[PDB]
Amino acid sequence: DRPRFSFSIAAREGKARTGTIEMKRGVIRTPAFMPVGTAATGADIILGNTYHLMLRPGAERIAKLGGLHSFMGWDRPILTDSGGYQVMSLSSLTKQSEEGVTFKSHLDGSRHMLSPERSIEIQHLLGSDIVMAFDECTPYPATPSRAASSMERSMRWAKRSRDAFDSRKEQAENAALFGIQQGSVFENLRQQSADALAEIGFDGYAVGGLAVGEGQDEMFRVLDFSVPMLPDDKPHYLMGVGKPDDIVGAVERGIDMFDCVLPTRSGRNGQAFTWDGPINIRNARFSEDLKPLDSECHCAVCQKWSRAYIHHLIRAGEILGAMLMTEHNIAFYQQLMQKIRDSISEGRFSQFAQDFRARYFARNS
Amino acid sequence: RPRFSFSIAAREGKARTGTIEMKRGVIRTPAFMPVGTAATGADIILGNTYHLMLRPGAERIAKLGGLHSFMGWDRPILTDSGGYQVMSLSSLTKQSEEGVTFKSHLDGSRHMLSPERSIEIQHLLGSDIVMAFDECTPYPATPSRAASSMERSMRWAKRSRDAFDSRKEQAENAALFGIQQGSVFENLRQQSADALAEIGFDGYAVGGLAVGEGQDEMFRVLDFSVPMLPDDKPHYLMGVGKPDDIVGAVERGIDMFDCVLPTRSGRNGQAFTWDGPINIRNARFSEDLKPLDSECHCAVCQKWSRAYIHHLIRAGEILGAMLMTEHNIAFYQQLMQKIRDSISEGRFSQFAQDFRARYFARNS
Numbered sequence: 001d002r003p004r005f006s007f008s009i010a011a012r013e014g015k016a017r018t019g020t021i022e023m024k025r026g027v028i029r030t031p032a033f034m035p036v037g038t039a040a041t042g043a044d045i046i047l048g049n050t051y052h053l054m055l056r057p058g059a060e061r062i063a064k065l066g067g068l069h070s071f072m073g074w075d076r077p078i079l080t081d082s083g084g085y086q087v088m089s090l091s092s093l094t095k096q097s098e099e100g101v102t103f104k105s106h107l108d109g110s111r112h113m114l115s116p117e118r119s120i121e122i123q124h125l126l127g128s129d130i131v132m133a134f135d136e137c138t139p140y141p142a143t144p145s146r147a148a149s150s151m152e153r154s155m156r157w158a159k160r161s162r163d164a165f166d167s168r169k170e171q172a173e174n175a176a177l178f179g180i181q182q183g184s185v186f187e188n189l190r191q192q193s194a195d196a197l198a199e200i201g202f203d204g205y206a207v208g209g210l211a212v213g214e215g216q217d218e219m220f221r222v223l224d225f226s227v228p229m230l231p232d233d234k235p236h237y238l239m240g241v242g243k244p245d246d247i248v249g250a251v252e253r254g255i256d257m258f259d260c261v262l263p264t265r266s267g268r269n270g271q272a273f274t275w276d277g278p279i280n281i282r283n284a285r286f287s288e289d290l291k292p293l294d295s296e297c298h299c300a301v302c303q304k305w306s307r308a309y310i311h312h313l314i315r316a317g318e319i320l321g322a323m324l325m326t327e328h329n330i331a332f333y334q335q336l337m338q339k340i341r342d343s344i345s346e347g348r349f350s351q352f353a354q355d356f357r358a359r360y361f362a363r364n365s
Numbered sequence: 366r367p368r369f370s371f372s373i374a375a376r377e378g379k380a381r382t383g384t385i386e387m388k389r390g391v392i393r394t395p396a397f398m399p400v401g402t403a404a405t406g407a408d409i410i411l412g413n414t415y416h417l418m419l420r421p422g423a424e425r426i427a428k429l430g431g432l433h434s435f436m437g438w439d440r441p442i443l444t445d446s447g448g449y450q451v452m453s454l455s456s457l458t459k460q461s462e463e464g465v466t467f468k469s470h471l472d473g474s475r476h477m478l479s480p481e482r483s484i485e486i487q488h489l490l491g492s493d494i495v496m497a498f499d500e501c502t503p504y505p506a507t508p509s510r511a512a513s514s515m516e517r518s519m520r521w522a523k524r525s526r527d528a529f530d531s532r533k534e535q536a537e538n539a540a541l542f543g544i545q546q547g548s549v550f551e552n553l554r555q556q557s558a559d560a561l562a563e564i565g566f567d568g569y570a571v572g573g574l575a576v577g578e579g580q581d582e583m584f585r586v587l588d589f590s591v592p593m594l595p596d597d598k599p600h601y602l603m604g605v606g607k608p609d610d611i612v613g614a615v616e617r618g619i620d621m622f623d624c625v626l627p628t629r630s631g632r633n634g635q636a637f638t639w640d641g642p643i644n645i646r647n648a649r650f651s652e653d654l655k656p657l658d659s660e661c662h663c664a665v666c667q668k669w670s671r672a673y674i675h676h677l678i679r680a681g682e683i684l685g686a687m688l689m690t691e692h693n694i695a696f697y698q699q700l701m702q703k704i705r706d707s708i709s710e711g712r713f714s715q716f717a718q719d720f721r722a723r724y725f726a727r728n729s
């Protein structure tokens with residue numbers, strides 16, 4: 001049968017790689033974009049907001065309903081985060097210590113807590129295939145003192161995540177665990193986090209603490225030295241990235257996995273991604289543009305709907321407009337990953353990145 | 366249960382409270398009718414006919430069991446006719462006496478709306494209350510533009526009546542509402558009302574409002590338009606509205622409401638409270654341990670504080686807007702219940718004064 005977790009590289013070019021991740025529920029073609037999973041009403045894997053799901057409707061409720069695969073109507077692999085991002089983005093509502101993170105008690109007495117052990121337990125109840133270690137996304141900007149103490153605490157939490165993950169045979173035999181590298185924008189702290197994660201051992205290694213307002217120039221600079229610190233024979237996950245040009249540049253620096261809310265956030269805010277850069281469909285230039293959102297896109301929206309139709313739908317307050325924008329953006333992101341995977345296999349990825357950026361920045365939509 | 370039976374239990378001024386009895390349940394009036402969604406306290410929900418015929422299509426919904434199966438909702442459902450999209454999407458339409466033809470899509474598909482096709486689609490959706498195919502006259506409109514538009518809509522209202530009665534299954538189990546037009550002009554409103562009464566309908570909706578006219582102008586049109594409709598029939602104000610808009614509209618004879626603001630506000634960081642709307646994104650709520658509203662009985666206010674929702678939206682968690690949306694919908698139903706209670710008690714005039722006094726002071 002299919003293996004638990006097997007990462008093989010089929011072709012390389014520079015620091016970029018293309019290949020597959022084999023799991024019991026399907027194959028993940030890398031470099032991969034992993035869209036946000038939703039409740040049931042082309043991607044290889046979807047994600048679940050662990051913090052969101054544990055509050056609504058609850059990890060135990062999800063488990064009794066059959067798991068996220070039953071909850072989201074998705075039989076392919078699923079990855080869940082650990083909540084370490086919400087440890088930072090919601091720090092004002094948290095009491096934090098070495099044991100874990102305790103959130104402010106609710107008006108009904110209910111109180112939620114996150115720890116390396118509880119996070120893995122929740123991710124097991126959700127039935128996810130790829131588990132993220134409980135970490136802390138260090139805020140940006142952060143002093144070298146604040147970044148060091150946070151990264152060091154996160155590495156202590158990473159070891160407890162490893163132990164808690166291995167404490168369940170059912171989870172350790174069917175799922176995979178990813179360590180998350182921290183260190184903010186500092187090379188030395190990044191090397192300490194990578195060394196700590198490798199000594200513990202993980203099926204995959206994620207680069208955390210980025211996509212928090214640092215800018216692409218700073219993000220690329222951190223990727224330049226951070227990704228070579230991770231085990232080459234293991235997949236590399238850049239959390240929170242990103243824009244199409246962010247993804248292309250990140251693949252050029254050794255990243256194999258991506259997640260981002262921009263396709264949905266842009267689709268709900270009137271922005272569509274095209275090969276000629278992003279477009280604001282609300283602009284009057286599209287009032288009578290009879291072309292689809294993107295001339296090359298093969299998604300269902302571009303085969304039927306014009307820019308003019310979508311422009312007037314959003315102007316008229318029809319939520320169908322944002323759904324088509326969202327539907328296009330998600331499919332466009334998968335088409336970007338496919339073109340990236342193709343170009344690495346052909347040995348023409350460096351040419352693709354140049355041609356992509358040239359046309360994506362000219363904005364000749 | 367009867368097909369459609371509207372009875373008034375208590376009156377005060379032009380305001381009324383009562384029930385609408387249908388084969389699938391009872392609708393307590395004055396009623397707010399939230400926007401129905403696909404399955405994942407209101408008496409009736411609505412379905413965007415124009416949206417549903419495009420996604421996933423009226424025929425697909427019919428084969429799935431109808432909107433009651435589609436939305437997991439066994440209670441009554443009301444569907445609009447598309448007459449609003451005739452105006453809001455007029456740039457993509459070719460309009461004539463026969464109906465409205467939308468611009469052909471990139472796959473050759475073309476959609477058309479007419480009094481006959483609209484009623485057929487609403488039958489395919491399996492809705493319990495059908496709206497006549499009309500045209501929401503744009504605002505502002507010249508008296509010439511409003512007259513031709515209203516008269517066209519009344520010819521469409523008659524064809525809607527005939528098409529509705531052409532199906533025994535629909536005519537014996539559903540209801541048809543006529544829609545009054547005339548923009549902001551009294552004489553044109555009287556012609557539309559007279560025309561709709563000569564045709565005959567189970568209910569009468571006040572259309573062509575909530576299109577940017579302002580509350581003062583909207584109330585002024587309601588002052589003379591609602592008394593033109595049959596008193597023994599329900600009155601539906603389409604698109605209204607804000608909480609104070611609803612209270613003022615009930616004061617002028619409206620029994621039914623629909624509005625996207627509870628969802629539009631919940632997604633844009635605005636929550637409705639008895640002390641007026643609040644912008645949860647303001648820093649004053651960063652540590653406000655109180656719920657969104659002190660009196661609200663919804664699930665969100667029993668568990669979540671203003672501080673928690675404020676930080677969720679600030680952190681980009683979509684759960685924040687869901688709680689805001691859930692509260693706004695439940696708050697709207699609590700407003701209708703308090704209105705229905707006060708009419709039954711004979712103290713509605715006092716409620717309207719007390720509501721506006723506290724709602725506009727903004728002492729949240």
Ligand SMILES: CNc1nc2c(CC[C@H]3O[C@@H](OC)[C@@H]4OC(C)(C)O[C@@H]43)c3nc(N)[nH]c(=O)c3cc2[nH]1
Pocket residue numbers: 036047048049050081082083084085086132135136137138180207208209210211212239240241259261680681682683
């Ligand atoms: C956007 N920038 C960005 N995302 C990051 C994440 C993922 C956190 C997001 O995963 C989403 O669910 C799948 C949730 O939806 C939003 C609201 C986007 O937040 C959650 C991170 N996760 C962990 N564990 N650790 C990190 O250092 C980290 C850094 C990030 N930077």
Ligand SMILES: CNc1nc2c(CC[C@H]3O[C@@H](OC)[C@@H]4OC(C)(C)O[C@@H]43)c3nc(N)[nH]c(=O)c3cc2[nH]1
Pocket residue numbers: 316317318319400411412413414445446447448449496499500501502544571572573574575576603604605623625
């Ligand atoms: C907000 N103001 C407003 N709404 C009105 C409507 C309902 C049309 C809306 O009903 C909603 O679905 C249930 C949809 O939400 C949006 C997207 C707002 O549009 C649909 C009207 N409908 C008809 N048939 N005729 C009218 O004269 C009319 C006037 C309106 N003024």
Ligand SMILES: [Zn+2]
Pocket residue numbers: 293294297298299300301302328329331332
């Ligand atoms: Zn597309």
Ligand SMILES: [Zn+2]
Pocket residue numbers: 657658661662663664665666692693695696
């Ligand atoms: Zn509430």
